[PDB]
């Protein structure tokens, strides 16, 4: 699934709305990318499926405390 492993972001539904205001179901899906992180804390490389922002979080919180969640939460990785 198109789900960001660190924030939990997934596709949402909405409309399109033409000038004539016609509603058409659509999806806004998240900006996944799946990036290879360096942990050091495990002398290993972790490939996560990550949303931008997800990345901005890992940058802020720090991978180690992020990977602390996930395990704490259930995700493989």
């Amino acid at each position: 699934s198109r789900v960001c492993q660190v924030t939990g972001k997934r596709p949402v539904t909405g409309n399109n709305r033409s000038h004539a205001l016609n509603a058409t179901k659509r999806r806004f899906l998240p900006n996944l990318h799946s990036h290879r992180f360096w942990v050091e804390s495990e002398k290993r490389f972790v490939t996560l499926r990550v949303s931008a922002k997800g990345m901005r979080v890992i940058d802020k919180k720090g991978i180690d405390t992020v990977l602390a969640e996930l395990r704490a939460r259930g995700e493989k990785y």
Partner: protein, 50 residues
């Protein structure tokens, strides 16, 4: 993405200073290859009392 340095490093290198880099350069080279660490406010006194 601010971060503090370790070894020298190009047009900012100073063994424990508060430089400001582009997030990419950081979390792809500088950190992965042991040359810096983000300015997470914990770390800002490990390499600021030198």
């Amino acid at each position: 993405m601010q971060v503090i340095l370790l070894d020298k490093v190009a047009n900012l290198g100073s063994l424990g200073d508060q430089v400001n880099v582009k997030a990419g350069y950081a979390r792809n080279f500088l950190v992965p290859q042991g040359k810096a660490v983000p300015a997470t406010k914990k770390n800002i006194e490990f390499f600021e009392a030198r």
